[PDB]
Design a protein around this ligand. Sequence first.
Ligand SMILES: *[C@@H]1O[C@H](CO)[C@@H](O)[C@H](O)[C@H]1NC(C)=O
Ligand SMILES: *[C@@H]1O[C@H](CO)[C@@H](O)[C@H](O)[C@H]1NC(C)=O
Ligand SMILES: *[C@@H]1O[C@H](CO)[C@@H](O)[C@H](O)[C@H]1NC(C)=O
Ligand SMILES: *[C@@H]1O[C@H](CO)[C@@H](O)[C@H](O)[C@H]1NC(C)=O
Ligand SMILES: *[C@@H]1O[C@H](CO)[C@@H](O)[C@H](O)[C@H]1NC(C)=O
Ligand SMILES: *[C@@H]1O[C@H](CO)[C@@H](O)[C@H](O)[C@H]1NC(C)=O
Lengths: 323, 173, 138, 49
Amino acid sequence: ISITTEVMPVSMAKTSVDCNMYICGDSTECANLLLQYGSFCTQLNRALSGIAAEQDRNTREVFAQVKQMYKTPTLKYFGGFNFSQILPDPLKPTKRSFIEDLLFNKVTLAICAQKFNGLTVLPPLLTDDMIAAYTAALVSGTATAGWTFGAGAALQIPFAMQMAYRFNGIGVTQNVLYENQKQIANQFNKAISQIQESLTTTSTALGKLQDVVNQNAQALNTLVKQLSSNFGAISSVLNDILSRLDKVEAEVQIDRLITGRLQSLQTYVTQQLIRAAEIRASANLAATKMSECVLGQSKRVDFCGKGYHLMSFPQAAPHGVVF
Amino acid sequence: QLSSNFGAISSVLNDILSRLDKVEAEVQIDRLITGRLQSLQTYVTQQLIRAAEIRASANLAATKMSECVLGQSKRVDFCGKGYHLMSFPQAAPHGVVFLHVTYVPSQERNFTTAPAICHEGKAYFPREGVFVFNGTSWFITQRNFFSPQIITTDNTFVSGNCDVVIGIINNTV
Amino acid sequence: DVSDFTDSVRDPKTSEILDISPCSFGGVSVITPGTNASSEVAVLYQDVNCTDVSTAIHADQLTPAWRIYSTGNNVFQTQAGCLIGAEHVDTSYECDIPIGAGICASYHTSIVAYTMSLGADSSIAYSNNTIAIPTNFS
Amino acid sequence: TTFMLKYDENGTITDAVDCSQNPLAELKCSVKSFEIDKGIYQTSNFRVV
Ligand SMILES: *[C@@H]1O[C@H](CO)[C@@H](O)[C@H](O)[C@H]1NC(C)=O
Ligand SMILES: *[C@@H]1O[C@H](CO)[C@@H](O)[C@H](O)[C@H]1NC(C)=O
Ligand SMILES: *[C@@H]1O[C@H](CO)[C@@H](O)[C@H](O)[C@H]1NC(C)=O
Ligand SMILES: *[C@@H]1O[C@H](CO)[C@@H](O)[C@H](O)[C@H]1NC(C)=O
Ligand SMILES: *[C@@H]1O[C@H](CO)[C@@H](O)[C@H](O)[C@H]1NC(C)=O
Ligand SMILES: *[C@@H]1O[C@H](CO)[C@@H](O)[C@H](O)[C@H]1NC(C)=O
C-alpha cells in the first residue's frame, strides 16, 4: 500500500488599486489633467474587481461540495486503521489537524495600517477556519458514513467493507483483504507516518504554492518601483517640479509623468488577467479531482494516484489543496 | 472614448482642421491619434483573453456531448448528480443546455451484516453483494437496491479455511 | 522605508523623532436590497477603523460628503472595513450578499449582517456491524 | 453639482437625479439607471481631508 501527495493552487491574493492616489498624490491640478483621458480609472477598477470576485468562486467550487457537515466521530480507529493526524484533535486549540499544521508553517510569506502607494489587499470570503471545517466533514464522511456520498446520502458502512468493496474494484477478490487485514492496516499507518516525517523535515515540497506567492509580490514591487522614476520630465516627484515651472511650462512635464504612470498601471492589470486564467484552469482541475477521487473510485490511469487507486483524502493548504 | 479629448483643443476632427491649417493642426492631431490608438489596442487585447476563456468552455461542452449524450459515463458528477442514465442536448442562444437523467436511491433501512460464513470448517465469501441478517434468516443482496436472495453455492465461493477472519457467522448454505 | 517613501522625520525644533502615516483613504461600496423592495442602503468603508471614520463624519471631513446622511449608532467593525447602516445579528444564514471574512448581509426582517452558515449539522451512527441499504429510488 | 437628466423621445427633459444627495443617488448616477438589482456595488473613493 502506497500514499502519495499532490499539491494544487486554487486561489491567489485579491488586490485593488486607487487609480487617482497612485497616478497623483494630493494635487488638485494633477486630478484635473487626468479627467481628460476619460474612462481609464474606471476600466482598471472594474477589471481588478472582476478578478477579485473570481477568486472566491474558485474556492467555493473545490471545497463546498458537501451539503452536510458531519461531526467528527471521536473514535478515529476503524478496524485497524489509525485515522488520527488527519482529523482534528479535540483537546487542541486549533481546529486543524496535525498534517494541516505542518503545511501552514512550511509555506511562508515573502491592526489596520495603510501605505502611501494607494495599493491594498482584500481578505478572502472564506476564513481558514471555514476551509479547515470543510475538509474535516469530507474526511469524516469518508471513513464513516459509507462510500455512498454525493450521489445519494451517507449509508453507514463499517469501513472494513469499504476496502473490501474497493479491492473488488481493482480486480482482486474480497478474501485478499480479510485474510491480510493486519498487514494492510499496518502498511497504511506506516505510509502516513512517512508523510509526517517528510513534511516536518523537508525543505521544498510545496513549490507550486510558493510560486504563486512570489510571482504576486514581484508584480507589486515593480509597480511601486516605477513611481520613483521620471519619464523625460524634470523629476519624478511632484510639487518639486510643479512650483518653479511657471503654470504652463509645468502642464507639459506633468503630462509626461501621467502618461508614463498609466502605462505602468495598464501593464500590471493585463498581466493579472493572464495569471488569473492560469489559476482558474488549475482550480477547475482540483474540483474534478475532489469529485472523482475523493467522492468515488477512479478508473482513469494516473489520474488520482500512481498505482491502482483505492481512495483519497483532502487536506487544506494556503491558497491550495493537498490530496 | 471617441467623445474624449486627450489633451488636444477639441475631440472632433474637422474642428481642428477648420480652425487650423498647418503644423499647428499636426501637433493637435498627433495627440488624438496617440490616444485613440491606445484605446483600440486595449480593446483588442481584452478580446483575446476573453476568447480563450470561451474556447475552454466550448471544449468542455464538446467532451460532454461525446461522453454524456453518446454514451453512459462512469465519472462521478461529470454528467449529473446521481448515477448518470441518459442526457439530451438543447440549443440555446450562443450556448447549449443539457438535460441529465440520473438515478437517486431514497428510502434506506438498517441491517446486520458479516464478512463471511462458516459452514463446514470453510469460509464462504460473497461475490457481488453483502450479507444481510434481515431478522429471521441470512440473505445476500446487491449494494444499491434491496432484494434478498437465498444463499447458494452459485452466490458465494469458498476461499480459505475458517480461521483468519474477524467476525464469521455460522449459517447453512 | 523599503518602498523609498518618507517613513519618518526629525523635528528641527531640537526635539525627538516622529512617524508619518498616509491619513486615511480607501473605497466605499453600497449594499442595496434591489430597489424593488426598499430604498434604504448600507455603506461599507473598506479597510478603516470605525472610530477614525466615525468622528470624521462628525467634523465634516469626508470628500464624499452626502448632504442628507447620518449614522444611527449601527457602526460595525467586521474586518473588511467599517460597516454603517446594517445591524449585527447572531443568526447564521445562507449569505445573500457577501462581505469580507465570513460576513454577509441580507434584508429579511432592515438590512441585517450575520455570519455564514456552512451547512446542516448532521451526525452519522458509525457501528462495526450495521449496514444501510436503500429500498426505493426515484 | 452633477445631475443625471432623463430625456424623452419627444426631446424634452422629464426626470433627473441629483448625484450628491444620498448614497443611493450616487449609485444611480454610477450605473446609469433608475432601478438596480440587489447586490454590492463599489463606487468612488473617500479621503479624510
Ligand atoms: C495513532 O497515531 C497517533 C499519532 O502518533 C498516536 O498518538 C496514536 O497512539 C495512534 N493510535 C494507536 C491506537 O496506536
Ligand atoms: C482602532 O483604534 C483604536 C484606538 O485608536 C484601537 O484600539 C483599535 O485596535 C483600532 N482598530 C483597528 C485598527 O482595527
Ligand atoms: C438505523 O439506526 C441508526 C442508529 O440508531 C438511526 O440513526 C437510523 O435512523 C436507523 N435507520 C432507520 C431507517 O431507522
Ligand atoms: C464488532 O465489535 C464487536 C464488539 O466488540 C465485536 O465483538 C465484533 O467482533 C466486531 N466485528 C468485527 C467484524 O470486527
Ligand atoms: C417508492 O416511492 C414511490 C413514490 O414515493 C411509491 O409510489 C412507491 O410505492 C415506493 N416503492 C416502495 C417499494 O415503497
Ligand atoms: C410624446 O408625444 C406624444 C405626442 O406628441 C404623446 O402622445 C406622448 O404622450 C409623449 N410622451 C411619450 C410618448 O412618452
